[PDB]
Design an enzyme around this catalytic site. Structure first.
Site, mmCIF file in Angstrom:
data_model
loop_
_atom_site.group_PDB
_atom_site.id
_atom_site.type_symbol
_atom_site.label_atom_id
_atom_site.label_comp_id
_atom_site.label_asym_id
_atom_site.label_seq_id
_atom_site.Cartn_x
_atom_site.Cartn_y
_atom_site.Cartn_z
ATOM 1 N N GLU A 66 27.169 7.223 -10.537
ATOM 2 C CA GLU A 66 28.058 8.175 -9.880
ATOM 3 C C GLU A 66 27.769 8.260 -8.381
ATOM 4 O O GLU A 66 28.687 8.124 -7.550
ATOM 5 C CB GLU A 66 27.909 9.547 -10.539
ATOM 6 C CG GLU A 66 28.124 9.535 -12.047
ATOM 7 C CD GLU A 66 28.279 10.926 -12.636
ATOM 8 O OE1 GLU A 66 28.226 11.912 -11.872
ATOM 9 O OE2 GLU A 66 28.435 11.032 -13.871
ATOM 10 N N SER A 80 7.756 -0.766 2.775
ATOM 11 C CA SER A 80 7.812 -0.371 4.172
ATOM 12 C C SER A 80 8.362 -1.523 4.999
ATOM 13 O O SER A 80 8.306 -2.687 4.594
ATOM 14 C CB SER A 80 6.430 0.032 4.701
ATOM 15 O OG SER A 80 6.016 1.272 4.158
ATOM 16 N N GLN A 86 0.823 -1.206 0.000
ATOM 17 C CA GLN A 86 0.000 0.000 0.000
ATOM 18 C C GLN A 86 0.859 1.258 0.000
ATOM 19 O O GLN A 86 0.559 2.224 -0.715
ATOM 20 C CB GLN A 86 -0.946 -0.003 1.201
ATOM 21 C CG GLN A 86 -1.764 1.268 1.317
ATOM 22 C CD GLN A 86 -2.933 1.138 2.266
ATOM 23 O OE1 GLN A 86 -3.179 0.071 2.826
ATOM 24 N NE2 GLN A 86 -3.669 2.228 2.448
ATOM 25 N N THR A 106 2.092 2.278 14.173
ATOM 26 C CA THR A 106 0.773 1.857 13.729
ATOM 27 C C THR A 106 0.676 0.335 13.640
ATOM 28 O O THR A 106 -0.242 -0.199 13.011
ATOM 29 C CB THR A 106 0.462 2.530 12.388
ATOM 30 O OG1 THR A 106 0.919 3.887 12.438
ATOM 31 C CG2 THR A 106 -1.021 2.573 12.123
ATOM 32 N N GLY A 122 3.328 -6.535 6.229
ATOM 33 C CA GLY A 122 3.677 -7.924 5.978
ATOM 34 C C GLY A 122 4.027 -8.189 4.528
ATOM 35 O O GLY A 122 5.026 -8.849 4.228
ATOM 36 N N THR A 123 3.207 -7.684 3.608
ATOM 37 C CA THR A 123 3.475 -7.904 2.195
ATOM 38 C C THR A 123 4.695 -7.112 1.762
ATOM 39 O O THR A 123 5.629 -7.661 1.166
ATOM 40 C CB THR A 123 2.271 -7.493 1.361
ATOM 41 O OG1 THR A 123 1.106 -8.151 1.862
ATOM 42 C CG2 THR A 123 2.487 -7.913 -0.080
ATOM 43 N N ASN A 173 7.981 8.312 9.143
ATOM 44 C CA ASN A 173 6.939 9.313 8.940
ATOM 45 C C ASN A 173 7.016 10.442 9.956
ATOM 46 O O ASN A 173 6.706 11.588 9.616
ATOM 47 C CB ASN A 173 5.550 8.671 9.015
ATOM 48 C CG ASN A 173 5.317 7.641 7.929
ATOM 49 O OD1 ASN A 173 4.572 7.881 6.979
ATOM 50 N ND2 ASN A 173 5.919 6.469 8.085
ATOM 51 N N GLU A 217 -3.615 -7.373 -1.987
ATOM 52 C CA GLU A 217 -5.039 -7.083 -1.667
ATOM 53 C C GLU A 217 -5.533 -6.076 -2.706
ATOM 54 O O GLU A 217 -5.084 -4.922 -2.662
ATOM 55 C CB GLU A 217 -5.181 -6.545 -0.243
ATOM 56 C CG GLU A 217 -6.526 -5.890 0.016
ATOM 57 C CD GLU A 217 -7.731 -6.724 -0.385
ATOM 58 O OE1 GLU A 217 -8.720 -6.135 -0.863
ATOM 59 O OE2 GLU A 217 -7.680 -7.958 -0.215
ATOM 60 N N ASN A 229 3.531 12.197 0.958
ATOM 61 C CA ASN A 229 3.833 11.527 -0.293
ATOM 62 C C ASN A 229 4.232 12.510 -1.379
ATOM 63 O O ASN A 229 5.025 12.166 -2.262
ATOM 64 C CB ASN A 229 2.632 10.709 -0.745
ATOM 65 C CG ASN A 229 3.041 9.443 -1.427
ATOM 66 O OD1 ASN A 229 3.883 9.468 -2.319
ATOM 67 N ND2 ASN A 229 2.454 8.325 -1.017
HETATM 68 N N1 GTP Z 1 4.561 7.367 4.484
HETATM 69 C C1 GTP Z 1 3.645 6.476 4.124
HETATM 70 N N2 GTP Z 1 3.624 5.230 4.718
HETATM 71 C C2 GTP Z 1 2.692 4.317 4.355
HETATM 72 C C3 GTP Z 1 1.758 4.621 3.382
HETATM 73 N N3 GTP Z 1 0.956 3.546 3.223
HETATM 74 C C4 GTP Z 1 1.369 2.568 4.059
HETATM 75 N N4 GTP Z 1 2.438 3.036 4.772
HETATM 76 C C5 GTP Z 1 3.204 2.293 5.783
HETATM 77 O O1 GTP Z 1 3.134 0.911 5.494
HETATM 78 C C6 GTP Z 1 3.049 0.158 6.683
HETATM 79 C C7 GTP Z 1 2.123 -1.031 6.478
HETATM 80 O O2 GTP Z 1 2.276 -1.574 5.185
HETATM 81 P P1 GTP Z 1 1.176 -1.252 4.057
HETATM 82 O O3 GTP Z 1 1.741 -0.299 3.032
HETATM 83 O O4 GTP Z 1 -0.060 -0.674 4.704
HETATM 84 O O5 GTP Z 1 0.811 -2.657 3.361
HETATM 85 P P2 GTP Z 1 1.913 -3.788 3.052
HETATM 86 O O6 GTP Z 1 3.310 -3.222 3.079
HETATM 87 O O7 GTP Z 1 1.607 -4.395 1.709
HETATM 88 O O8 GTP Z 1 1.719 -4.907 4.187
HETATM 89 P P3 GTP Z 1 0.298 -5.616 4.420
HETATM 90 O O9 GTP Z 1 -0.640 -4.631 5.069
HETATM 91 O O10 GTP Z 1 0.479 -6.819 5.312
HETATM 92 O O11 GTP Z 1 -0.262 -6.044 3.086
HETATM 93 C C8 GTP Z 1 2.507 1.096 7.749
HETATM 94 O O12 GTP Z 1 3.304 1.024 8.906
HETATM 95 C C9 GTP Z 1 2.589 2.487 7.156
HETATM 96 O O13 GTP Z 1 3.404 3.319 7.947
HETATM 97 C C10 GTP Z 1 1.774 5.870 2.782
HETATM 98 O O14 GTP Z 1 0.943 6.151 1.921
HETATM 99 N N5 GTP Z 1 2.718 6.799 3.157
HETATM 100 MG MG MG Z 2 -0.700 -3.959 3.114
#
Ligand code: GTP
Ligand code: MG
Ligand code: GTP
Ligand code: GDP
Ligand code: MG
Lengths: 430, 376, 50, 440, 434
Positions: free
Chosen positions: E248, E134, E11, E173, E138-139, E200, E65, E222
């Site tokens: 470089e 991130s 995400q 979070t 998990g994903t 963040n 997802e 973002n």
């Molecule tokens: N800065 C920022 N962080 C994000 C954003 N979206 C998700 N995150 C970070 O991503 C972490 C969770 O992962 P997600 O991006 O929600 O989803 P994922 O990485 O695919 O992992 P899953 O939820 O298990 O599928 C959270 O701790 C958020 O801090 C975003 O739009 N901006």
């Molecule tokens: Mg996710």
């Protein structure tokens, strides 16, 4: 006196031969209709080498187009200069050989050869004295690579003293478009080495590189290969149709190109190939000409001459120059490049100069040479031919046509016979 | 390609000189890519591939045209099908454009005004109609008043005769004329021929055809399809040289502009007519140029490639050398040194000089005669 | 599926591919073998400095 | 001049012919009446239609196709169809009673009634044609008519015309999905027919078509019409070199000599690209290298098999449309410069390239978008052995109990031929094993 | 020519791709359809032109997802992207590196690998794979880890820049996130050339203190992420006096193979109300680059020593004022460099100024700058993370999910040992030979 007939076999031979009759007909100013529409007198003096006079001043090509598939005729009949040809020279059958050498050579070819031989007999008689014969075919087909060798085999028995020359197209291993291509080639080369005065090996892939790098065309077609060979095709015969400061003809080269009867394979060249951008920065001179002949990004063969020592070199120059440097650069290129020329033949080079330039250009030149590089093109053929043959692969059509297993063993023996004594001619002491 | 989309076809005719027989062929055009094809009719073969021919354009697709296709001078005689008739040539029509003798000086302006309104000139000649020919025009006016006045004016000067082809040509050509009374025309709209240069209703510039039936009567009177040219040419073979407006200048619509640039130069225009000569007549005319110039056949090809207008330039002014008014043969050297020459004002590629003019002073009468006595 | 793309851009009959304008016969390399200096002189004469 | 005659058998053949002849009439410009458009009867010096149609006195063109079946319905829907006047009413040959999935029924009892009529009609069509090239025989291995009648028709056709070429398009029972359970018996028994009496066979399973049209065409709910359009496109790509002109014209004899290594091995696999809807060709630029890669993706094959488990003996490329031989050579070099695609030790050159000018057309209401360039692929590879391996397995699990054998016996067929055909198919498998064996 | 492919995961990846691609189309002039109405083919690094003249981006959004990618399909750029660039999986990992790395990812590994294969075949001479995820999700942990593992052997030499959101030291979070962050670090150690760890919380502090926005959202952060990647890639996208490719700054930012973790900074981040009455110049923005309150990672570089600096000016900037600024920065005792780098600076010059999206936060300012600082002040955040992981792992809480998934239990201890060794290595760098 000196007259040439233009035999034409297979789809590869047809398009090259058809586009050739295009090229010369502007050099002589002959209209699609076929009347004389040139300006100078010299432009109409020696049309009799390739053209036969007709009633009212009409000029007809001296050629016989042969193909097992009638469709290539329809591709030829209807082009730009398509209808200039003789309505009865087209001799064709109803089934193709399908790239199968045996069907063209034995099964279907035996019925079409007679009708072709009468037409060439009529045209051989039409002119008073023939200098030689001319025929274009690919070695990877079944019509030109097949029946065409049968046509050459018969015609030497008929006319032994005249010149037989062919612009054989040689398959390239890197880009190959026939699964039985080496099988047709190894059966054809044995037909050639027994019966030909001279042969030029032309590879499409070398033209593919030349179009890509020297000329830098974005989207070359199959007209690029045909036009480039046709200009080369006209260059070797300009000193015949046209007077020069130093004269030559096919036999002048033929006596001087062939040191031993077995070695008659040559690599073609053409000097003024430059991209449209490169024209802006180039002062037309002879020093860059000999530079453009001798750099082998210009060869139309796929064999680097740095691997194989040069035996005999010929460069026919087209255009009006003086010659004190074309003898100097002759001598210049020989002396400093000592290791690449054979030692028992000093003065390896032979030249011809014709006063008349080509249409659309001031200077031009055509380069032909006998070199040990060509031995790389045969030993590569044995590398795939033996692979198919060790498993008897793709054999059942040639066997099913009525011939034995021995013919393949004989061809490879003679193919290996050629390169072995060719290798001997590379390694010999003066 | 895909053998689809617009694929119009005409019926070609070619005079084969060797066989000495007229042969009819299937002519094919593909407007989507501008490509050309042609097939044999009787032998049931293909005469010519689908190759493009930029020399042949959609502007050249009409009946009674002398196109050049692979050096074959082809006259299209019939619509090859129904669907070619419906799209290409449903409403294109041919109508006469006579210019009355008052406005003959204004012709180079009017011909320009003709070209701007999309009309295409097919027949072009200046004529001197007899009284009996003049009465044949005004047959509709025999009962109507001022018959003699209408006859007397028309046979009092070198009448200009044109034929213009365009879609809705009869209606547009009459619309370009404006009201017949020239005084009324100015009050209505000056943007007409009869208003810009006209003076009175009797001396209006032009009196074009009104209906199809009326048109067909007058067109044969001037330009006979029978070949029996009624009114003789106004060609005084005296102290004259000839000027050929080459076909490339015709197609770009400079015909009126070249005529303007001659008249203001104080050069008499005794005679002007259009000739669609073939290659054989080109070789006879350019026979002197054969060999001296290194581009004889290119010089040959341009004249027969399209329609050309030959003009007899009368020799006048204190400075008479029309030879220098055309100027140097190459337009580029003309542009570099003598821009006041026509081959610099109307210059183009070396071959595509504005006009051809006589070079030797003696050859003037001979070239005038060849173009206006035998060919005329 | 109906992705509901822009009505005035997407359709089925418009041809979607890379036009590579290439001409099979001898024209392009004929004009290439035509050296440009002869082309320029056929266009007309040229002029250089004194 | 080239002519090839279509011999469609069974419901599969009839529906395939419907789609194919629709495609051909669209390709050449023939209305459902069977004429030229009158107002634009341009036509001219090209008789490219000659390979599929033939003129008559009234200026009408009849296809050289015979649709033959033993149940009236499948042809009666054609006789009531839009192309009712396109065909000759005697060209459409029907039987009273069908074979009903019975090889012995379509081969020994019901077919023999109309054998002579079918033979007379193909004889008449061959008399109409001047220079004949080959037969295109369309059937399935499932249906009783499509197996037995095709078998006997070709058995007599070989002695009638021993030398004319015989291309065989047929539908294989799918590996998992099926519309029949008695079908492996028929499929085993027609192996002798398609082995001894053919020059080239083009087996296709439905399930790969299912996968491809749901993968690329995005049709979640396709139908036999959607299969038939694709198959007709394959046939058009094969025959377009005969139909129109091309830079490298290739005929049926040419692809024959360049696909078949040995007399017993005449089973290449067909592949098409690009099969894509208009939405997807919008954003992808398609070019020769990438469509060539699409020809070699194993998940784009018409056959449920993995060619990576086997080795290619031959490949035939049929490029069509706006194509350039230079990118052709670049693409073939790129393909050869890979290790995943294997080649046997005895074909270091393994390709037959054909190049054609005109791009394929599309039918309104179809599934394929119109693109400037397309390519058909014909791969003779040894990976097809596993399909007949699973077929032999399935047949054996029937044969251990002699299931459904009483039907064939009562029909009047001698039981041992089942075992004989099994031995023949096993020998074919062993021959493919010998092909896979490389002498390193 | 030059080209980079974007491989957003999760995400966070898909939202970052949304913002970055919006900024890219506005930067070059792409209409939302994809059609064009310094440099000529400046789009060619991220776009592959159709035959009609349309331009397609070079990115594959990957997710397990579909709900998110679905908003992109229902977004205006449905006319821009192509659907098979937008890959979705049925059931998510649910903050489980175990699920994302061993169970659910293998269903789509082959598909995403094939899509990268086709896009890299569209690419002629490739320059970069830029990837985003991130360390909490998990994903975005497991699938990104296995994807990078495969990409290591499928592109051995190709530069694979890694951008990742790290768990913020205070605001979290997620509760399971330290396990995933510990586990993921092996992949970013052994399979990356450069990684852009960002939390963040520091972004929130900066946008509050400078941009006057009291209530930010993921779009607000973002946009700044998109601006950072725009500044990074503008040297490749358009001509500059001193262009800077990826090779470089990789060459000039990584002292040892174990050390490839820079810190990003961007200046100025200022509203228009604050920016009208402020005259801006190179010295001021350079001084703002080193203030610890504007660093997007919760650490003080004054607690460590810089080993490398990558300055990237943009807009109306001149090399002499660069040299003046670099003189003032080197003449300061507060900023500390290691004893083995007396010269530690990279300057990139770029002609065009950064663009401003409508409805954004940054003011249209004639000059801007980016900072890639490689300092030893970054091991302390991992020290906090290891403390959190230890106080987790002494109890074996939440271990049962991963175990029932089926990973071996000792990999946790192995990854902890790897992180400990990494921090000891950074201490070895921080030691001076005086
Ligand atoms: N800065 C920022 N962080 C994000 C954003 N979206 C998700 N995150 C970070 O991503 C972490 C969770 O992962 P997600 O991006 O929600 O989803 P994922 O990485 O695919 O992992 P899953 O939820 O298990 O599928 C959270 O701790 C958020 O801090 C975003 O739009 N901006
Ligand atoms: Mg996710
Ligand atoms: N590709 C394709 N296959 C079809 C189609 N219709 C039937 N088949 C196949 O044909 C097989 C059965 O044979 P049919 O053609 O339906 O009927 P038949 O050949 O006349 O044999 P009988 O019904 O026993 O008389 C089935 O297993 C199908 O796989 C079709 O429209 N397209
Ligand atoms: N140079 C050149 N080669 C051609 C042309 N057309 C075909 N070929 C070559 O000819 C080969 C096919 O030969 P083929 O038609 O089977 O020969 P045939 O059996 O004698 O008719 C191909 O590999 C092409 O490379 C052409 O126009 N020019
Ligand atoms: Mg049935």
């Amino acid at each position: 006196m000196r007259e040439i007939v233009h035999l034409q076999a297979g789809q590869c031979g047809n398009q090259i031969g058809a586009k050739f009759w295009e090229v010369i007909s502007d050099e002589h100013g002959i209209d699609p209709t076929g009347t004389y529409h040139g300006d100078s007198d010299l432009q109409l003096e020696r049309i009799n080498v390739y053209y036969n006079e007709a009633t009212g001043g009409k000029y007809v090509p001296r050629a016989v187009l042969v193909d097992l598939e009638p469709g290539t005729m329809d591709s030829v009949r209807s082009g730009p200069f398509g209808q200039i040809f003789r309505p009865d020279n087209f001799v064709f059958g109803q089934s193709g050989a399908g790239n199968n050498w045996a069907k063209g050579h034995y099964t279907e070819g035996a019925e079409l050869v007679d009708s072709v031989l009468d037409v060439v007999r009529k045209e051989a008689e039409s002119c008073d004295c023939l200098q030689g014969f001319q025929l274009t075919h690919s070695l990877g087909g079944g019509t030109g690579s097949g029946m065409g060798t049968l046509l050459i085999s018969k015609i030497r028995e008929e006319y032994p003293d005249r010149i037989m020359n062919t612009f054989s197209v040689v398959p390239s291993p890197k880009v190959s478009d026939t699964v039985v291509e080496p099988y047709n080639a190894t059966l054809s080369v044995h037909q050639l080495v027994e019966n030909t005065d001279e042969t030029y090996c032309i590879d499409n892939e070398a033209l593919y590189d030349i179009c890509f790098r020297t000329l830098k065309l974005t989207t070359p077609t199959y007209g690029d290969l045909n036009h480039l060979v046709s200009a080369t095709m006209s260059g070797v015969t300009t000193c015949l149709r046209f007077p020069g400061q130093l004269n030559a003809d096919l036999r002048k080269l033929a006596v001087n190109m062939v040191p031993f009867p077995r070695l008659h394979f040559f690599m073609p060249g053409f000097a003024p190939l430059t991209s449209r951008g490169s024209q802006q920065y180039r002062a037309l001179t002879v020093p860059e000409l000999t530079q453009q002949m001798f750099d082998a990004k210009n060869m139309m063969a796929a064999c680097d001459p740095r691997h194989g020592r040069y035996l005999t070199v010929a460069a026919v120059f087209r255009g009006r120059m003086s010659m004190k440097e074309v003898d100097e650069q002759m001598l210049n290129v020989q002396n400093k490049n000592s290791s690449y020329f054979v030692e028992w033949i000093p003065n390896n080079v032979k030249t011809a100069v014709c006063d008349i330039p080509p249409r659309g250009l001031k200077m031009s030149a055509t380069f032909i040479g006998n070199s040990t590089a060509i031995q790389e093109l045969f030993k590569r053929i044995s590398e795939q031919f033996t692979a198919m043959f060790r498993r008897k692969a793709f054999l059942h059509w040639y066997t099913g046509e009525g011939m034995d297993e021995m013919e393949f063993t004989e061809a490879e023996s003679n193919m290996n016979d050629l390169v072995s004594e060719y290798q001997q001619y590379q390694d010999a002491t003066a | 390609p895909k053998n689809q989309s617009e694929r119009f076809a005409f019926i070609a005719e070619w005079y084969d000189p060797n066989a000495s027989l007229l042969r009819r062929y299937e002519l094919l055009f593909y407007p989507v890519d501008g490509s050309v094809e042609m097939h044999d009719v009787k032998n049931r073969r293909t005469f010519l591939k689908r190759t493009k021919y930029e020399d042949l354009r959609l502007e050249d697709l009409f009946i009674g045209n002398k196109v050049n296709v692979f050096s074959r001078q082809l006259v299209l005689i019939d619509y090859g099908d129904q669907y070619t008739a419906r799209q290409l040539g449903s409403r294109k029509e041919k109508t006469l454009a006579l210019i009355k003798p008052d406005a003959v000086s204004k012709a180079g302006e009017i011909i320009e005004m003709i070209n701007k309104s999309g009309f295409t000139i097919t027949k072009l000649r200046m004529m001197t109609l007899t009284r009996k020919e003049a009465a044949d025009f005004h047959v509709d006016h025999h009962s109507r008043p001022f018959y003699n006045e209408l006859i007397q004016f028309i046979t009092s000067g070198p009448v200009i005769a044109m034929e213009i082809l365009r879609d809705d040509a009869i209606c547009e050509w009459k619309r370009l004329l404006g009201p017949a009374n020239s005084g009324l025309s100015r009050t209505d709209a000056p943007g007409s021929i009869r208003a810009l240069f006209g003076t009175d209703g009797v001396r209006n510039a032009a009196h074009g055809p009104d209906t199809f039936a009326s048109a067909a009567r007058e067109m044969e009177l001037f330009f006979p399809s029978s070949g029996g040219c009624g009114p003789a040419n106004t060609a005084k073979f005296t102290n004259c040289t000839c000027c050929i407006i080459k076909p490339h200048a015709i197609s770009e619509g400079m015909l009126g502009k070249n005529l303007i640039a001659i008249r203001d130069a104080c050069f008499g225009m005794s005679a002007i007519q259009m000739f669609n000569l073939d290659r054989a007549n080109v070789e006879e005319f350019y026979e002197v140029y054969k060999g001296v110039v290194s581009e004889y056949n290119d010089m040959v090809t341009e004249l027969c490639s399209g329609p050309c207008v030959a003009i007899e330039i009368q020799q006048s002014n204190p400075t008479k050398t029309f030879r220098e008014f055309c100027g140097p043969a190459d337009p580029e050297i003309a542009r570099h040194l003598r821009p006041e020459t026509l081959r610099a004002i109307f210059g183009k590629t070396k071959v595509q000089n504005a006009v051809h003019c006589t070079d030797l002073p003696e050859d003037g009468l001979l070239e005038v005669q060849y173009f206006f006595k035998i060919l005329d | 599926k109906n992705r509901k793309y822009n009505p005035a851009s997407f359709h089925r009959f418009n041809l979607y591919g890379i036009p590579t304008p290439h001409f099979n016969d001898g024209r392009t390399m004929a004009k290439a073998l035509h050296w440009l200096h002869e082309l320029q002189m056929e266009r007309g004469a040229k002029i250089v400095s004194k | 001049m080239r002519e090839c005659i279509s011999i469609h058998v069974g419901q599969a053949g009839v529906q395939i012919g419907n789609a194919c002849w629709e495609l051909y009439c669209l390709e050449h410009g023939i209305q459902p009446d069977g004429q030229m458009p009158s107002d634009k009867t341009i036509g001219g010096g090209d008789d490219s239609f000659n390979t599929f149609f033939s003129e008559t006195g009234a200026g009408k063109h009849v296809p050289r196709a015979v649709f033959v079946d033993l149940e009236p319905t499948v042809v009666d829907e054609v006789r009531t169809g839009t192309y009712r006047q396109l065909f000759h009413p005697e060209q459409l040959i029907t039987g009273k009673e069908d074979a009903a999935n019975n090889y012995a029924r379509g081969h020994y009892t019901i077919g023999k009634e109309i054998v002579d009529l079918v033979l007379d009609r193909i004889r008449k069509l061959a008399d109409l044609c001047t220079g004949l090239q080959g037969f295109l025989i369309f059937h399935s291995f499932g249906g009783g008519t499509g197996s037995g009648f095709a078998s006997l028709l070709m058995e007599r056709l070989s002695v009638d015309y021993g030398k004319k070429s015989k291309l065989e398009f047929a539908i294989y029972p799918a590996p998992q999905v099926s519309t029949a359970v008695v079908e492996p018996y028929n499929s085993i028994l027609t192996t002798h027919t398609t082995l001894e009496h053919s020059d080239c066979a083009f087996m296709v399973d439905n399930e790969a078509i299912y996968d491809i049209c749901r993968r690329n065409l995005d049709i979640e709910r396709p139908t036999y019409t959607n299969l038939n359009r694709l198959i007709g496109q394959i046939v058009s790509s094969i025959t377009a070199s005969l139909r129109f002109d091309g830079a490298l014209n290739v005929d049926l004899t040419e692809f024959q000599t360049n696909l078949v290594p040995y007399p017993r091995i005449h089973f290449p696999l067909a592949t098409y690209a690009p099969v894509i809807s208009a939405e997807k060709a919008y954003h992808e630029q398609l070019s020769v290298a990438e469509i060539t890669n699409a020809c070699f993706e194993p998940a784009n094959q018409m056959v449920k098999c993995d060619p990576r488990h086997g080795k290619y003996m031959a490949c035939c490329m049929l490029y069509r449309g706006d194509v350039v031989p230079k990118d052709v050579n670049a693409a073939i070099a790129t393909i050869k410069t890979k290790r995943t695609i294997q080649f046997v030790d005895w074909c270091p050159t393994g390709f037959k390239v054909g190049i054609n000018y005109q791009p394929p057309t599309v039918v309104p209401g179809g599934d394929l978008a119109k693109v400037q360039r397309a390519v058909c692929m014909l791969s003779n590879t040894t990976a097809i052995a596993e399909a007949w391996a699973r077929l032999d397995h399935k047949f054996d699990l029937m044969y251990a109990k002699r299931a459904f054998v009483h039907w064939y016996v009562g029909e009047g067929m001698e039981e041992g031929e089942f075992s004989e055909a099994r031995e023949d198919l096993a020998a074919l498998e062993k021959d493919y094993e010998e092909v896979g064996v490389d002498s390193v």
